[PDB]
Amino acid sequence: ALISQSIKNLKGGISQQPDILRYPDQGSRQVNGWSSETEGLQKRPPLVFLNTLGDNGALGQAPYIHLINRDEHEQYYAVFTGSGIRVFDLSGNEKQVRY
């Protein structure tokens, strides 16, 4: 019957449902993919490098991290080690905390 069809959206996203039950443009899986508005499927943004915070164990094994946005010039992380606090600027520089 020479049937063909084309899809323009692919906004979709991963669906675990059966292929029969999947909406058109869902797709079985996508990794590192960005489904950006009208624009098509894209690679995720590149994650540019900023300063390394420290050693692997410098932060806690399971830390609590809360970004601070006070000013357009001052932004910070308040990352909580299991014991103690560390505070870095978004530039990567570490601002020492005194208790």
Binding site: I3, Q5, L10, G40, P45, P46, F49, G54
Partner: protein, 244 residues
């Protein structure tokens, strides 16, 4: 792999995420701007997963062996784990270095070739953008948001095509029950105006690849690694579909 994402936090326009390797902890930002390049130079806004505008020091090059060697712990904070690092020149040139068995720990030197004495190269890893298209079946959307698939009958699909804009190389894996196929789409093509040497080589086009099978047992998934944007603006397929 072996990388833990401690916290992703987003300022209005871009998101700053810190993630730990088995040796280090890093800070990095993911910027969601529509077209803007992240770094100065940077011919086409490369996707390198850790981007630095490195300048190679004068002590790196030696003449006894032609290779110019660069030390990863100096360019970054310190040594990494397992990954494929791409070095990208101020122009389009790319050199990719396979992950050694020790994994960049015992061997932290990446050796370019020739005199890259003081170059503005960009050094970064790779991202494996995988997308699996799901099955290709007769799907009609009806009643304002309900799609029904014609389960009755057998579809023998002949081929498929993917439309891309300002996109580089990518591989369209087609995997039937028995065997698998790749169909790498790299360049413009040998007689094309675009393939002109020294030109950035990425452009808009349609790629049609032969996909044959039962339309129900063969999986078509696209993926790419080679540090070049990939924007997929369409997809399609052709089939016979005798109903029985």
């Amino acid at each position: 792999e072996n990388v833990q994402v401690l916290a992703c936090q987003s300022i209005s326009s871009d998101m700053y995420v810190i993630l730990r390797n088995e040796f280090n902890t890093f800070l990095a930002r993911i910027s969601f701007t529509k077209n803007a390049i992240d770094l100065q130079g940077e011919p086409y806004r490369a996707f390198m997963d850790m981007k630095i505008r490195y300048t190679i020091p004068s002590g790196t090059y030696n003449d006894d062996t032609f290779t110019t060697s660069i030390h990863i712990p100096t360019i970054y904070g310190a040594n990494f784990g397992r990954g494929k690092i791409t070095v990208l020149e101020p122009d389009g040139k790319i050199t990719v270095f396979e992950q050694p068995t020790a994994g960049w720990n015992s061997d932290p030197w990446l050796r370019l070739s020739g005199n890259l004495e003081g170059r503005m190269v960009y050094i970064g890893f790779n991202i494996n953008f995988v997308y699996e298209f799901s099955k290709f079946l007769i799907k009609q959307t009806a009643d304002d948001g309900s799609t029904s698939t014609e389960d009755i009958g057998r579809l023998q699909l002949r081929r498929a095509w993917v439309n891309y804009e300002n996109s580089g190389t990518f591989d369209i894996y087609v995997e039937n029950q028995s065997s698998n196929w790749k169909y790498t789409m790299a360049g413009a093509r040998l007689g094309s105006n675009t393939l002109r040497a020294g030109r950035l080589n990425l452009g808009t086009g349609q790629y049609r690849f032969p996909v044959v099978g039962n339309a129900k047992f063969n999986t078509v998934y696209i993926l790419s690694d080679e540090t070049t944007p990939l924007n997929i603006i369409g997809c399609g397929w052709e089939g016979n579909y005798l109903r029985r």
